[PDB]
Design a protein around this nucleic acid. Structure first.
Lengths: 166, 64, 88, 74, 135, 70
RNA sequence: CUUGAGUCUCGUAGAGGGGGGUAGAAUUCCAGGUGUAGCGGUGAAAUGCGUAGAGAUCUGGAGGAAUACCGGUGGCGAAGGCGGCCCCCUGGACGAAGACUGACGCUCAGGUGCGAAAGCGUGGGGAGCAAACAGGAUUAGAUACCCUGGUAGUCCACGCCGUAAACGAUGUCGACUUGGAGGUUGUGCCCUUGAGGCGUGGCUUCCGGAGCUAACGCGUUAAGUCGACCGCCUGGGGAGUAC
């Protein structure tokens, strides 16, 4: 959709579901809230928070917001070379380049989100707020500037980007 | 209050009045109107209200 | 603030003979001369603390400019310090 | 043509009259009502210096009975 | 030296006191190598509020330069003069000793704003018609 | 503070507005209260603050027009 | 060396500090003159005060703090801090021309120096206001709430440990980052013609980009990018006490 990556069949990564009410003015609210991530195995920014009266409509709204006005991210499947010191709203992450030979430990659903993110190997334990909504921001702000070179010319690589600005 | 004093002084044989005003309280004009209803010309409404050069501290009133 | 006619005698007598105000010796001698003027106010006015703050600026800075000359030439220094009667 | 420099009604729309002088009676009376008293600085759009110095000069002048200090002195 | 613009005003009936006092004050100034750069008497004027009684005073502008040590003693002097009702002395900053801001207001006074009476005749011998001993 | 200066042709009602210039404010305004020395510098001097809401109100008349609600 | 910083005389803006001098006006008071019954207080009220003549008012004297407005989004001080008006003594800050030295720098544990306010020892001084102390009133009671009397204080001078909500609730001082415009000032240039424009410093404030924040918010005077060096915090109650 629009600028979205070369995605193929849907990612249906449901991360969370909740239900919220004031109940102040006419009995409770019945509507539900959903948080969903839609990627492609090669690295995406797709993250969508949406809501509707019952769960099936809540997820399908949330999944649209997971997929529209999302830029391509160019990592090579499971290797990434140039992360970011990831911060989102006090939930802070700090990945650095690393072998995939070493494995991944990560708790809850999270080793599963990270393996579809392509970022499992560079990953290191979260700090700051450990709230379900913001703990997963590893693949968004932590990739916001990146490269993943396969080229023998890795040591000319920043040179190559200047002479295009010339 | 003005119509009460203004009645009593006919016996002193006063026949004309002029007025001096001294304060911010109510009766700004209404006090004047009652001397003028006593049958006097009240052409000179001379505010002489003393503005001290910032005088003596007024009472605190309530303790909050 | 110091008198026009003292400032010109001080310049005549201190630093080199160029009658400049900038070198380290003439700058101690000018600072001293205001410090002394201000001590004239502090013959009275013993509760005038907000101006004493000012004294310690001029004093501290002279302390610094004395360290600087003594890090440099010792002839100028041993002369100057004895020549304004500073310290004991 | 150049260097005419402060003829009239230029730099400022309202002329600054005095700073700190009070020996002329007329310069103070430039900002003084018929009640015998200063007009506030918000209303006239006077520049703060000429006003700040006039605050001393006007009090000085009033104390020398060049002005009424008080409504009782009208 | 530094310039101090002293203005003082005098009770009409007491003006007769001042022609002996003023010439000692001028000798005390010049005795300190200061100067009288104008000495303008303005004539009688109406006070807004009385000071030591009467709504009228006679205003005298000395226009001194005197050293800083001396003016603190002269200022105390002019305020505690009884013939003087009140006095004010202004700063060295932004001062004229030429070209008087009251030159017109002075003349207007002698022409037009006195009483023209016996009680203001008393002022005029202490006024511009000034008499003083020679230094 | 009816003010001494007489309104042209004498009448029973004093024209209090056209006379007054700077009377009551600060001196006879903080009535039956404890008089402070430095407090007025922050308590009373609120002229700039009160001017902003009046600039905002006069802006929004034109903005109801630009949104087209009027 | 100047690219950091320092200094000479000159101008400029301001409530920075210490000690002197000075005026009128209401409460308050006294005296005489005039004159009769409430005055005061409040939500409504009563205590107080008063016929020895109150309250207010005319004339004149008395006395002590204070000095409103001008006072403004102003300006100043080291932070809190500074406001009657003047002088003596003097700081610190803002510009500008001639001229000099040339890292003499930065920060700062310990350190000396310094109080918003009241507390405070004696002398001076007291008009009003006021904790206490009395008495009124409030009410399921009422020390809180609300009223009347009324003292130390407040006011000066010197003296005693500098407390705090001691402010940017924002460390010090320095470098850099699209800006416009308000308030207002040094000074070059303007039919100076619109508290105006432009050149260049000055403090001061609204508005918002890059960036940063949980959020408000900050934004060229940062809460940004940073710089060196320092102070300080590490769950609550119990404790700013114990030692």
């Amino acid at each position: 959709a629009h600028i979205e990556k070369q995605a193929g069949e849907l990612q249906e990564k449901l991360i969370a579901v909740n239900r919220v009410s004031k109940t102040v003015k006419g009995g409770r609210i019945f509507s539900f809230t959903a948080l969903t991530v839609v990627g492609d195995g090669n690295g995406r920014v797709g993250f969508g928070y949406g809501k509707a009266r019952e769960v099936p409509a809540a997820i399908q709204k949330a999944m649209e917001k997971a997929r529209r006005n999302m830029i391509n991210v160019a990592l090579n499947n499971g290797t990434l070379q140039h992360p970011v010191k990831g911060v989102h709203t006090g939930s802070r992450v700090f990945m650095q380049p690393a072998s995939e030979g070493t494995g991944i430990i990560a708790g809850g659903a999270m080793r599963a989100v990270l393996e579809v993110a392509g970022v499992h190997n560079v990953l290191a334990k979260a700090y700051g707020s450990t709230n379900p909504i913001n703990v997963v921001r590893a693949t968004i702000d932590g990739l916001e500037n990146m490269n993943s070179p396969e080229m023998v010319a890795a040591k000319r690589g920043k040179s190559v980007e200047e002479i295009l600005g010339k | 209050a003005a119509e009460r004093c203004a009645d009593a002084v006919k016996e002193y044989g006063i026949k004309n009045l002029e007025v001096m005003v001294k304060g911010p309280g109510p009766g700004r004009e209404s006090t004047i109107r009652a001397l003028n209803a006593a049958g006097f010309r009240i052409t000179n409404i001379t505010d002489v209200t003393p503005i001290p050069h910032n005088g003596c501290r007024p009472p605190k009133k309530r303790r909050v | 603030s110091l008198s026009t006619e003292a400032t010109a005698k001080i310049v005549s007598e201190f630093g080199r003979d160029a009658n400049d105000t900038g070198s380290t010796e003439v700058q101690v001698a000018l600072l001293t001369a205001q410090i002394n003027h201000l001590q004239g106010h502090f013959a009275e006015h013993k509760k005038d603390h907000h101006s004493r703050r000012g004294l310690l600026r001029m004093v501290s800075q002279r302390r610094k400019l004395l360290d600087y000359l003594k890090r440099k030439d010792v002839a100028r220094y041993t002369r100057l310090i004895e020549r304004l009667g500073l310290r004991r | 043509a150049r260097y005419f420099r402060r003829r009239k009604f230029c730099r400022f729309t309202a002329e600054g009259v005095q700073e700190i002088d009070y020996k002329d009676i007329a310069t103070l009376k430039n900002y003084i009502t018929e009640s015998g008293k200063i007009v506030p600085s918000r209303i006239t759009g006077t520049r703060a210096k000429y006003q700040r110095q006039l605050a001393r000069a006007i009090k000085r002048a009033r104390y020398l009975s060049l002005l009424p200090y008080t409504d009782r002195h009208q | 030296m530094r310039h101090y613009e002293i203005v003082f005003m005098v009770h009409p009936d007491q003006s007769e006191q001042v022609p002996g006092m003023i010439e000692r004050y001028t000798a005390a100034i010049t005795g300190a190598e200061g100067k009288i750069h104008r000495l303008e008497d303005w004539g009688r004027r109406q006070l807004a509020y009385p000071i030591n009684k009467l709504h009228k005073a006679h205003y005298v502008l000395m226009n001194v330069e005197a050293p800083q040590e001396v003016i603190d003693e002269l200022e105390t002097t002019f305020r505690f003069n009884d013939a003087v009702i009140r006095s004010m002395v202004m700063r060295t900053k932004h001062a004229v000793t030429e070209a008087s801001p009251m030159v017109k207001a002075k003349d207007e006074r002698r022409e037009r704003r006195d009483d023209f009476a016996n009680e203001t005749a008393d002022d005029a011998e202490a006024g511009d018609s000034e008499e003083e001993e020679e230094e | 503070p009816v003010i001494k200066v007489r309104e042209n042709e004498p009448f029973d009602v004093a024209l209090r507005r056209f006379k007054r210039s700077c009377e009551k404010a600060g001196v006879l305004a903080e009535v039956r209260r404890r008089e402070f020395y430095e407090k007025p510098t922050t308590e009373r001097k609120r002229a700039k603050a009160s001017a902003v809401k009046r600039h905002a109100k006069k802006l929004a008349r034109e903005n109801a027009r630009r949104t087209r609600l009027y």
